[PDB]
Amino acid sequence: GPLGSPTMELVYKDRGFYKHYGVRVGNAIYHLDSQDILSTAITGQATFDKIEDDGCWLVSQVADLDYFTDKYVNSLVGTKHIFSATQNCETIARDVFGDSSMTQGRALGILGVILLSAGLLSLMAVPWDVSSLQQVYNQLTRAAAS
Amino acid sequence: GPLGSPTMELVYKDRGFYKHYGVRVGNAIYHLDSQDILSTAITGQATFDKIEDDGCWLVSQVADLDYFTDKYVNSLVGTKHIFSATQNCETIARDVFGDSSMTQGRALGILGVILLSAGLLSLMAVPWDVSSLQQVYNQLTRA
């Protein structure tokens, strides 16, 4: 089902070792501004930026991705997250989620869930159907020592 | 090369979709206490714990992994990292690195880099030889 506002498009660039997702709204693309996904994870700091579409992004079929992302949207509602934004992201909540009452902060958290979920699932080559997504989610939430 | 003390081993359990890594010293295993890497990444909070070996861990051949992990350790020396630990890990520096003078924080940063690197590189199906690792390093860091 839908991830956000009526015109938001999940897009990506294929960087070979990983696919890098963003969201396109009109000619604006919102995405994480660093390719160093390992540094991002280790430091707990990720910054969104808004860029112009360069014509080189591909569109993702969203399929049932929301089944998976909703689990984290719900589970990390009252939880500090790692996402900040540049000054160019003033209207991200409205653009991406269609909700002017949502704070920028809350929008960054939800969008960061979506983009990291898409990127991780792509790395795992997991299709975005409910069955496949539930299977991955079960392994992610399995007790670490088990 | 070696990643730590002379008896330290890189170990994992295979979850199919990914491998969950830890480091072993004797029958003590130090690992992240959640394998929900999304929650870990989104919240910027990873907690090490120390468990007993159940005999069901596999040993990784480390090859040249330290070539890659050392680069990240060196980049994040004067840099906050996300790794904390339960109190069971008070002796991780002496156990894992063989250095009682090393701070717990420094030990956790190094081991966190190693475990996340191993996990990510495995997902990428990258040989842990220097040439392969230099190629993915260059892509990650935009050199």
Numbering used by the authors:
A (entry chain B): -4 to 141
B (entry chain A): -4 to 138
List sentences quoted exactly from the publication behind this structure.
Parechoviruses, including *Parechovirus A* that infects humans as well as *Parechovirus B* (formerly Ljungan virus) and *Parechovirus C* (formerly Sebokele virus) that infect rodents, belong to a group of picornaviruses whose 2A proteins, instead of being proteases, contain a conserved H-box and NC-motif and are homologous to a small cellular lipid-modifying enzyme (PLAAT3) that acts as a host factor, enabling the picornavirus life cycle. Despite the common evolutionary origin, 2A^H/NC^ proteins and PLAAT3 have no conserved function, as the active site of the viral proteins cannot support catalysis. Our structural analysis has shown that the topological rearrangement first observed in HPeV1 and leading to the apparent destruction of the active site configuration of the enzyme is indeed a general feature of *Parechovirus* 2A proteins. The C-terminal α5 region, which is a unique C-terminal extension so far only observed in *Parechovirus* 2A proteins, clearly plays a central role in determining the order of oligomerization as well as other correlated and sometimes far-reaching structural rearrangements.
Intrigued by this observed disorder in the C-terminal region of the *Parechovirus B* structures and its apparent influence on protein oligomerization, we decided to extend our structural characterization to the H/NC-motif type 2A_2_ of Sebokelevirus (SEBV1), the sole representative of *Parechovirus C*, which like *Parechovirus B* 2A_2_, exhibits shortened N- and C-termini compared to *Parechovirus A*. The structure of SEBV1-2A_2_ was determined to 1.56 Å resolution in space group P2_1_2_1_2 with two molecules in the asymmetric unit and was refined to 20.16% R_free_, no Ramachandran outliers, a Ramachandran Z-score of −0.40±0.53 and a Molprobity score of 1.16 (98^th^ percentile) ([Table tbl1]). All 134 residues could be modeled in both chains, and the final model includes an additional 5 residues at the N- and 7 residues at the C-terminus that were introduced during the cloning procedure, as well one ethylene glycol molecule, a tetraethylene glycol fragment and 256 water molecules. Overall, SEBV1-2A_2_ is similar to the LV 2A_2_ structures (3.70 Å over the full chain; 1.2 Å over the core 97 C_α_ residues), in SEBV1 however, the C-terminal α5 helix is well ordered (and extends to include two of the extra residues past the native protein boundaries) ([Fig fig1]). SEBV1-2A_2_ assembles into the same overall dimer configuration as HpeV1, despite having closer sequence identity with LV-2A_2_ ([Fig fig2]). In SEBV1-2A_2_, the C-terminal helix α5 folds back onto the globular domain, which positions it close to where α2 sits on HPeV1, and α2 shifts ∼7.5Å away from the interface.
